[PDB]
Amino acid sequence: KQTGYLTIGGQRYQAEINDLENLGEMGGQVWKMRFRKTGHVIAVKQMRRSGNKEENKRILMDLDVVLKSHDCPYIVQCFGTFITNTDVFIAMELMGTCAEKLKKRMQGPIPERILGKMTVAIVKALYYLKEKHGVIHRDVKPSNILLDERGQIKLCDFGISGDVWSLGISLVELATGQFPYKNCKTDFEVLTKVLQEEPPLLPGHMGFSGDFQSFVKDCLTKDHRKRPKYNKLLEHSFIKRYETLEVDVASWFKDVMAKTES
Secondary structure, three states: OOOEEEEEOOEEEEOOEEEEEEEOOOOOEEEEEEEOOOOOOEEEEEEEEEOHHHHHHHHHHHHHHHHHHOOOOOOOOOEEEEEEEEEEEEOOOOEEHHHHHHHHHHHHOHHEEEEEHHHHHHHHHHHHHHHOOOOOOOOOHHHHHEEEEOOOOOOOOOOOOOHHHHHHHHHHHHHHHOOOOOOOOOOHHHHHHHHHHHOOOOOOOOOHHHHHHHHHHHEEEEEEOOOOHHHHOOOOHHHHHHHOOOHHHHHHHHHHHHHHOO
């Protein structure tokens, strides 16, 4: 298909691995690279033909989904691929940070303003995944939510091929700056807390809108059978509010990344 091409914006370039400058690792081996022939800076996943066959199956499934999702603006886009005898390089849209690294930098709550726009983008991405490819995600975390300096929020291409309840937990973590289950010393203890304890709802003493508290309360319905599908979350007043409301995400993001490090 598209291999040996980078397709950035509208343009298309005859490309090759030598036509890229490696600017260093970002965080699974994903590089920050410069396309020499334009100066375009991009993200590059290297898949080593000699790697864990399980990492590589995971990367190929995840890429399959991204290539299918060219039309969804809430999912990081593929620019193209290079295949050599030893490696596949996967050119991805470069984003500024993930929500986890963004929380660590903030060292406190993220404003409801920001998390509204993020809930819209993520719910829509997950709806697009189920609706149009019958993909469930089964790994919704702050580390899988990506932001860029132009205010775009997108769902990250990791286990993008395998719910509501994790979006809830992700939103409480970022709203408050605290993981609800940060005291649990094992994974089984977390699950024990999920089943046995009241859902970890937003507190009422941080000036969160009733809409935001309702959306999370909904997401953290303890009975599987009474939790709403996406069809119904997209109709929640919280989403509707932040679909239309202009929020300067781009400015807020720049302020945070400038006034903090790693």
